[PDB]
Design a protein around this nucleic acid. Structure first.
Ligand SMILES: [Zn+2]
Ligand SMILES: [Zn+2]
Ligand SMILES: [Zn+2]
Ligand SMILES: [Zn+2]
Lengths: 72, 527, 585, 186, 187
RNA sequence: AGCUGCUCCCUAGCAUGCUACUACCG
RNA sequence: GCGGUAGUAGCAUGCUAGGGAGCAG
């Protein structure tokens, strides 16, 4: 299950980076730090809280229209 | 100032779905993802250039170096070297960068092109009477890794490597085209080369025991004296082609270009204190000279520092006495005793070297009495000479020779049955193969149909796992085979759907069968 | 790499010498090259002889040697003639159908857009080819617009007046606001940020938008943009439903919307519905009705210009709750009573060129006449509206075609929706003309309106027509009728109440002379829509098809809501016009 | 390849040779059918050679141009496949903590900062209406990210702090609704 | 290869061969006209075969000399670019202070690591955190390299201007913090 | 954006070499 | 009937060049 968390963290960081998030240094530093801790984690529960913390960054802005992208 | 980040690698989902289809990545399995594409924040380059703070001005025991250098010299008397003209240099990949500030106008092809075969020789003869400081750029690598530390590589300017190639190339290409020596640069592991290497280092020692190591941050913990000595040992062969002033000015140019050159890290010049720059012409051989120097120094320390009243074999005691005599009570080289000691070493300390990744087969009933270097002696030498503490979680020691080195060049060794006899093959870490399969740079994969050859190569490198007793290992190769099969017979159908004839003849069936791959590990060379 | 226009089979050949370089189906591409002057083709890599120092661009002579394309004198011994079998080598050659008749596309691509026959070919053809023709004409006119000289100002005379010079070797554009300039301020580095201006004879008169101080060295250009390849059709497929789809009917009704609701169920009864909208019948009020007829409907106010959406915005500040309106203007002064750049809003007010890609409960398209097939399909690209309303009329002013030279393009052939309006008829009709009296509604009804428009209040007997001859004199971009300029003052002196009437003119420079003589305000016939005045006057000036053809005059005559003045120098419509004729002084 | 014109000549020569060998007539007369048949396979195998080469070279060039087209369009659409694949994986993940915040952000509750993980530190959540308030906040407890938070400071859109008890269905159309609510981890 | 002096010879030989084959006079005629076609082929052989290698040799020579000419042209452009870069970057340095410190040397040769230290007209600082900022760039003036500088145009990592009053202790965690403080030499 | 070493795949060329067919001469 | 030579096609080996990709330090 953790391997899925690592893969989704990778793709999440890629989409965040192409959303032009590195224009603000502190935000990019926090994101890369969280991503590195997710990739190096050995157990699933802390991976998931760092995962939700990382996803909240994507949810914060308005660039990713969510209702359309959630088409089920 | 400019801040450079490191991006994360992309995801190849289709291969991951195929892997989970075949019952992979299940919890509690041995194979698991560990090699990822890490990311780095804004100030990643300078936070890695700052590691040169581990370089301290060091003094060397001169009356012992003046003997270790003789023995290391004798280790390199099998090859040839000399200056070569402009019309004989051999250069691969002429479209690489030309350093700073030359990368503002074109790649190395332009500067290797505009100079006629007389301008290059005019320059190479100019540098033998002058000193040319240069500016080195510093760049980060973008590759899979198992540790989150970045990697920084130095792009030296063209005016340095252009002349260093002419100066050193004859010896460099004579080292890489020799088989059976101590240095094993250029010997391939395919077609039964690894087995030949391993049977080379087992040569005639009596009660062997393997021993290996690697150096923590080898390029930055390098003292300046050992770099100088390595360059001197490399340039020694020019006894006839050059004068004595010419050799000194070439050495001064080397020290001005790869030892204290003004590194241009970021957007501003700094001063590199010391240590090798890893992106110059002769790094991979200077490191070999370093490694042999440390081995000889460890042997010298281990033999001198023994209570010479308990030693029972008379010959080694006389060796001790003469060793001290020619070390400290003498001033000039004694080639008779240098030959004597080199014979003693190569009879009781066999070696295999690449650029700082070594393997040593030593007689053990001597090392247990301190007549040759043990693995603590390298700790002591690295401590008082390299200013690094050698952790015993990086040096291994093996005693059952039927299994080869625990690790060499990042490949484990296994003894299988190949035909009628038994061979040694290098098998990689399976997680490395899977991580190369899944994480890629956006078109180089994530659509397998476009490449296919990368999967062919990866299945070539992942073959020796097919003989592994651990069942979860061979399924990696079998999965790779089935993925190549799926890719091929999906590309054919997709092209047929977009066209109206299918590929008339391919003979591609060899790619998804083991017979094409088992031929790369048998002792009969089809290049 | 896409599917070709005619065949929709995937291909990779692109017509090189062609204007917009369309995706060409392989054998279909061979037909296009052999039947046109377009002899250049580009695949993923271009089909040009790669041997150094070559010139040949025609595909036919090009042969395939190895991994490249070669003309006859450049090949290696091994070749493969690409121009073979009547089928140029290209991607998806077998998944190819070709076209039996391509000469329609051949004439569309070889079209300079000169005659009305060009627009006839564009409109009469099908979806993909009509879209291609629209894009090509837009790009081609945009190309000619910058081909004219530069508008440099070398002397500053006074306020609203300048002395301007022009580039040598290139002509001068007309002297009206029909083509608004755009100058930028030139500095030692580059030219930036002056603004959009209109130049007319004064010595020239510049009509800038905002306040500015123009000095010497500042020159104005006809700025061009990059026309992008359109995707959606001009009209979505028609489908008549069985119930009111997607909307909840209203509970109570308004008497001002009593005549609106009667036609409103059939608006929501089907996908798209067409309108017969005469001038001054409450079409904007008709559009407002859907908001009151459906409070929960998210309707979008769209038109060719912000000044036309302004009419919808004009009736929005009164009836529409301001808490749910949004006006979108790209980063020109206009109405901004709403909040700007708010996609997620109920009432959206924007021009067809700037509204982002959304979805709409029901669209209102104001002034469909001037919106050609280009912007007809632009809106469908942005929105897949659940309902569609076309507010406008084919019997209303179209966009002025700067490339149409000979022949007058038919009113029906403006675009797709106006074409069906003359064949199957309009779905709606508003039978009350809320401004024009019996003297105007009755006359305009018998002209192109099929006698379908009826009088509102009375025959005011304040609309007058005159018989006259005149002698015309013309200039670079105008024509002034001197006897009518003598007549107009002569008519107005003997009744001082007539001086409150505005002067309308086909060539606005003619009224510029009249404005000097009399001082009454100015009107442009081509843009007189949206604005109406109780007292307004007109001079026919010319009887040519440019000014006084049947439909381009209908807007000017309908400007007045009590009485209008117009001296007919012609006789084509003077006989038909049911106005009062008086003695010529 | 049999549709080539020279195949008819080859067939005629082969038939003549077969008839001659079935007859066994002469010694030199059939030698005419070795100086005309062995010749007959000289303009056939040479003419059947390059066309077989030509078809394969055409196939290999067309497939390489196809791969070039595919690689050209795949890098021109990356910033929608990234997101679609992302959310497909996220839905496959089936985690309650992610699901709660995704539903909330879809209906409007988008936090205006990183969600903190320590038991300290502040979270700031927009709540643009009242129905969305009904599910999440209950008195002094904030439910978000499947955690328990303590509401401390709500504020309207014009930066005027509002008391917690004031808000209600009747008085809901009386505040600048995009509230931001400061709360801390349990 | 049709304008060679072999096309006419082959044409006339084959014309004679076909004329006498239609005539069918003698077997010796057939032998003679077979020998004619068996000697006129060698004419055609080396008259239309070697000339098909001279063309390839000429073409490859032409391409090679084209490539050499392009190489020379690229050399010309890079020479011009390098000379103009040198001549445009030398004009920024020759201040009178540089000449002053070059005249005071015993030999005219001075170390490189003191020229910017004693003639630069602008100083760049990089500060990782507020604690280092307090000790070095405190206030609107600071002293480094035994000179006097005045702080001007403080900027953060995002390269946006930050005024001096913002950098307090409590406000520090709200700034991108490789602060690059610029200053100029005061007299 | 570095210096190497090894390996796989595609193409092009020269030369070498082999085989097969045709022609000339001895 | 043999040999030699000159052409044509096919096949193999190897050397060089160009392009793509992977691994190790
Ligand atoms: Zn030398
Ligand atoms: Zn065309
Ligand atoms: Zn087609
Ligand atoms: Zn050509």
């Amino acid at each position: 299950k953790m391997s899925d968390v690592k893969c989704t963290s990778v793709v999440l960081l890629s989409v965040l980076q192409q959303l032009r998030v590195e224009s603000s240094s502190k935000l990019w530093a926090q994101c890369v730090q969280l991503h590195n801790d997710i990739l190096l984690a050995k157990d699933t529960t802390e991976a998931f809280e760092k995962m939700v913390s990382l996803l909240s960054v994507l949810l914060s802005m308005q660039g990713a229209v969510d209702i359309n992208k959630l088409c089920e | 100032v400019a801040f450079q980040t490191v991006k994360p690698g992309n995801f190849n989902k289709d291969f991951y779905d195929f892997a989970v289809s075949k019952g992979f990545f299940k919890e509690g399995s041995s194979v698991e993802l560990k090699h990822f594409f890490f990311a780095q924040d804004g100030n990643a380059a300078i936070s890695d250039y700052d590691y040169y703070r581990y370089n301290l001005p060091t003094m060397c025991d001169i009356r012992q170096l003046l003997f270790v250098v003789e023995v290391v010299d004798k280790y390199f008397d099998c090859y040839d070297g000399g200056c070569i003209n402009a019309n004989q240099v051999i250069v691969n990949n002429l479209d690489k960068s030309a350093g700073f500030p030359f990368n503002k106008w074109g790649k190395a092809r332009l500067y290797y092109d505009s100079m006629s075969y007389e301008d290059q020789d005019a320059l190479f003869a100019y540098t033998k009477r002058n000193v040319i400081p240069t500016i080195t750029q510093m760049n980060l690598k973008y590759a899979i890794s198992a540790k989150n530390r970045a990697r920084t590589v130095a792009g030296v300017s063209i005016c340095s490597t252009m002349t260093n190639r002419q100066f050193h190339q004859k010896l460099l290409k004579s080292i890489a085209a020799t088989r059976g020596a101590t240095v094993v640069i250029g010997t391939s592991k395919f077609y039964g080369g690894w087995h030949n290497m391993l049977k080379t280092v087992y040569s005639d020692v009596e009660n062997p025991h393997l021993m290996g190591w690697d150096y923590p941050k080898c390029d930055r913990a390098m003292p300046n004296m050992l770099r100088i000595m390595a360059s001197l040992v490399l340039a020694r062969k020019h006894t006839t082609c050059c004068s004595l002033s010419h050799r000194f000015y070439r050495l001064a140019n080397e020290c001005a270009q790869v030892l204290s050159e003004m590194v241009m890290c970021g957007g501003s010049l700094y001063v590199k204190p010391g240590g090798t720059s890893s992106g110059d012409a002769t790094t991979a051989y200077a490191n070999s000279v370093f490694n042999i120097c440390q081995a000889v120094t460890a042997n010298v320390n281990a033999l001198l520092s023994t209570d010479g009243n308990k030693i029972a074999d008379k010959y080694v005691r006389n060796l001790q006495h003469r060793l001290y005599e020619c070390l400290y009570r003498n001033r000039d080289v004694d080639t008779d005793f240098v030959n004597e000691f080199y014979a003693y070493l190569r009879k009781h300390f066999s070696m295999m070297i690449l650029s700082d990744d070594a393997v040593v087969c030593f007689n053990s009933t001597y090392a247990s009495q301190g007549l040759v270097a043990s693995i603590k002696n390298f700790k002591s030498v690295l401590y008082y000479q390299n200013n690094v503490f050698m952790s015993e979680a990086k040096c291994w020691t093996e005693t059952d020779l039927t299994k080869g080195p625990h690790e060499f060049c990042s490949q484990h060794t296994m003894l299988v049955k190949q035909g009628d006899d038994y061979v040694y093959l290098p098998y990689p870490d399976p997680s490395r193969i899977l991580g190369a399969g899944c994480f890629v740079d956006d078109i180089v994969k994530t659509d397998g149909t476009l490449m296919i050859e990368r999967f062919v190569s990866l299945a070539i490198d992942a073959y020796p796992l097919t003989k592994h007793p651990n069942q979860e290992y061979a399924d990696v190769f079998h999965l790779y085979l089935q993925y190549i099969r799926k890719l091929h017979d999906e590309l054919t159908g997709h092209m047929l759907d977009m066209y109206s004839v299918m590929l008339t003849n391919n003979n591609t069936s060899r790619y998804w069968e083991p017979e094409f791959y088992e031929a790369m590990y048998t002792p009969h060379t089809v290049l | 790499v896409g599917a070709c226009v005619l065949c929709n089979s995937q291909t990779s050949l692109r017509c090189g010498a062609c204007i917009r370089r369309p995706f060409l189906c392989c054998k279909c591409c061979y037909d296009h090259v052999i039947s046109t002057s377009h002899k250049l083709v580009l695949s993923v890599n271009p089909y040009v002889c790669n041997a150094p120092g070559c010139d040949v661009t025609d595909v036919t002579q090009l042969y395939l040697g190895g991994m490249s394309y070669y003309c006859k004198s450049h090949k290696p011994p091994i070749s493969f003639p690409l121009c073979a079998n009547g089928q140029v080598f290209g991607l998806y050659k077998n998944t190819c159908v070709g076209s039996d008749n391509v000469t329609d596309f051949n004439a569309i691509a070889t079209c300079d857009w000169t005659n009305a026959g060009d627009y006839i070919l564009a409109n009469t053809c099908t979806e993909r080819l009509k879209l291609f023709a629209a894009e090509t004409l837009k790009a081609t006119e945009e190309t000619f617009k910058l081909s004219y000289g530069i508008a440099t100002v070398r002397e500053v005379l006074s306020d609203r007046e300048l002395h301007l010079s022009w580039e040598v070797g290139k002509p001068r554009p007309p002297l009206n606001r029909n083509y608004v300039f755009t100058g930028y301020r030139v500095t030692k580095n580059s030219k930036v940020q002056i603004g959009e201006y209109t130049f007319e004879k004064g010595a020239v008169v510049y009509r800038g938008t905002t306040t500015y101080k123009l000095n010497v060295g500042d020159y104005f250009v006809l700025t061009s943009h990059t026309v992008m390849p359109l995707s959606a059709p001009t009209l979505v497929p028609q489908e008549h439903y069985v119930r009111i789809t997607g909307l909840y009917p209203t509970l109570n009704i308004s008497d001002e919307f009593s005549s609106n609701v009667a036609n409103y169920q059939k608006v929501g009864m089907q996908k798209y519905s067409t309108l017969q909208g005469p001038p001054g019948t409450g079409k904007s009020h008709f559009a407002i009705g859907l908001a009151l007829y459906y409070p929960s409907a998210r309707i979008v106010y769209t038109a060719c210009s912000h000044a036309a959406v302004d009419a919808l915005c004009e009736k929005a500040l009164k009836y529409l709750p301001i808490d749910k309106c949004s006006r979108i203007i790209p980063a020109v002064e206009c109405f901004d009573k709403f909040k700007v750049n708010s996609t997620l809003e109920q009432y959206v007010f924007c021009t067809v060129n700037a509204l982002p890609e959304t979805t709409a409960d029901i669209v209102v398209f104001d002034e469909i006449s001037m919106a050609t097939n280009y912007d007809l399909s632009v809106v469908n690209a942005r929105l897949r509206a659940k309902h569609y309303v076309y507010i406008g009329d084919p019997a209303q002013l179209p966009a002025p075609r700067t490339l149409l030279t000979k022949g007058t393009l038919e009113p029906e052939y403006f675009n797709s929706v106006c074409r069906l309006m003359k064949t199957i008829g309009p779905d709606m009709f508003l039978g009350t003309c809320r401004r024009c009296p019996a003297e105007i509604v009755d006359t305009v009804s018998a002209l192109v309106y099929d006698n379908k428009l009826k009088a509102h209040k009375d025959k005011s007997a304040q609309c007058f027509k005159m018989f006259y001859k005149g002698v015309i004199t013309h200039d670079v971009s105008s024509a002034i009728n001197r006897p009518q300029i003598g007549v107009v003052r002569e008519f107005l002196t003997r009744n001082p109440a007539w001086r409150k009437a505005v002067f309308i003119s086909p060539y606005n420079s003619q009224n510029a002379v009249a404005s000097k003589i009399l001082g009454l305000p100015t009107q442009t016939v081509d843009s007189s829509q949206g604005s109406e005045y109780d007292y307004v006057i007109f001079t026919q000036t010319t009887e040519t098809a440019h000014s006084c053809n049947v439909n381009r005059f209908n807007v000017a005559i309908t400007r007045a809501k009590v009485g209008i003045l117009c001296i007919m120098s012609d006789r084509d419509l003077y006989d038909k016009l049911q106005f009062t004729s008086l003695e010529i002084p | 390849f049999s549709s080539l014109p020279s195949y008819a000549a080859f067939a005629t020569a082969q038939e003549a040779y077969e008839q001659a060998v079935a007859n066994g007539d002469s010694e030199v007369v059939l030698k005419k059918l070795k100086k005309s048949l062995n010749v007959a396979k000289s303009e056939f195998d040479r003419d059947a050679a390059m066309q077989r080469k030509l078809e394969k070279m055409a196939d290999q060039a067309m497939t390489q141009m196809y791969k070039q087209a595919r690689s050209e369009d795949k890098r021109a659409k990356v910033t929608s496949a990234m997101q679609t694949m992302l959310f497909t994986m996220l839905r496959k993940l089936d985690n309650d903590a992610l699901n709660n915040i995704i539903n909330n952000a879809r209906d409007g509750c988008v936090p205006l900062n990183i969600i903190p993980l320590t038991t300290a530190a502040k979270l700031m959540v927009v709540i643009p209406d009242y129905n969305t308030y009904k599910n999440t906040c209950d008195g002094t407890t904030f439910t978000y990210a499947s955690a328990l938070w303590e509401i401390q400071q709500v504020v309207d859109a014009d930066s005027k702090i509002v008391q917690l008890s004031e808000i209600s269905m009747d008085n809901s159309p009386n505040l600048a609704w995009p509230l931001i609510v400061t709360a801390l981890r349990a």
